[PDB]
Amino acid sequence: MLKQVEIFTDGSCLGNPGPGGYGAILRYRGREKTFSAGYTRTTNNRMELMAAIVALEALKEHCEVILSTDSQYIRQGITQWIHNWKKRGWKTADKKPVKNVDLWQRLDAALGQHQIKWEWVKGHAGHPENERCDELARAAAMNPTLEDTGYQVEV
């Protein structure tokens, strides 16, 4: 029985925009939960962030987490952008709302409920868990059931 919650995530998309999906594995309490869904029209980046979102939102108490992903988007966001975006009221240099702000605020709210340890894996060197996520993400995109509301060609 693990002393840390372990989460693995991946996202996939067939176009820009296109039908995509995500896969997430959550090792919580003494179970392994698997989340995966496809969306009819979305992007690779929204799907990546959605992976993280659904897994953290499943947590009911404050946890000590370790999140493993090979997503560059999440990494860039977490390590270089989010900090400056919270101080700027979630706007770009040119005062427009940041890209995927719906998702980044949503994620931001889920991150602040826990202690997070980020583990950036390499595309070709993750655990069997990351590969299973890649696999779920890809399966989901081939059979989209949901609508990705937040998506705009736009802002």
UniProtKB/Swiss-Prot annotation:
For this protein, the record's PROSITE patterns field holds:
RNASE_H_1 (PS50879)
Q: Which family does it belong to?
A: Belongs to the RNase H family.
Please verify whether the record's keywords include Disulfide bond: no
Phenotype for residue 48 to Q: Loss of activity
Top EC group: hydrolase
Protein name per Swiss-Prot or TrEMBL: Ribonuclease HI
The annotated consequence of gene deletion is:
In a strain that encodes a retron, the msDNA is abnormally sized.
Main subcellular localisation: cytoplasm
**One Pfam family from the record:** RNase_H
Function per UniProt: Endonuclease that specifically degrades the RNA of RNA-DNA hybrids. RNase H participates in DNA replication; it helps to specify the origin of genomic replication by suppressing initiation at origins other than the oriC locus; along with the 5'-3' exonuclease of pol1, it removes RNA primers from the Okazaki fragments of lagging strand synthesis; and it defines the origin of replication for ColE1-type plasmids by specific cleavage of an RNA preprimer. Involved in production of retron derived msDNA (a branched RNA linked by a 2',5'-phosphodiester bond to a single-stranded DNA).
Catalytic function, reaction form: Endonucleolytic cleavage to 5'-phosphomonoester
Tell me how the cofactor is bound: Binds 1 Mg(2+) ion per subunit in the absence of substrate. Requires millimolar levels of Mg(2+) for maximal activity. Has low activity at micromolar concentrations of Mn(2+) and is inhibited at higher Mn(2+) levels. Can bind a second metal ion at a regulatory site, or after substrate binding.
EC number assigned by the record: 3.1.26.4
Q: What GO cellular-component annotations does this UniProt entry give?
A: cytoplasm
Q: Which UniProt keywords apply?
A: Cytoplasm, Endonuclease, Hydrolase, Magnesium, Metal-binding, Nuclease
Q: Which residues form the RNase H type-1 domain?
A: 1-142
According to its UniProt record, where is this protein located?
Cytoplasm
- Organism (species): Escherichia coli (strain K12)
Q: Which residues bind Mg(2+) 2?
A: 10, 134
Q: Where does Mg(2+) 1 bind?
A: 10, 48, 70
Required co-factor?
Mg(2+)
GO biological process terms, alphabetically, are:
DNA replication, removal of RNA primer
Quaternary context: Monomer.
Single GO molecular-function term?
Answer: endonuclease activity
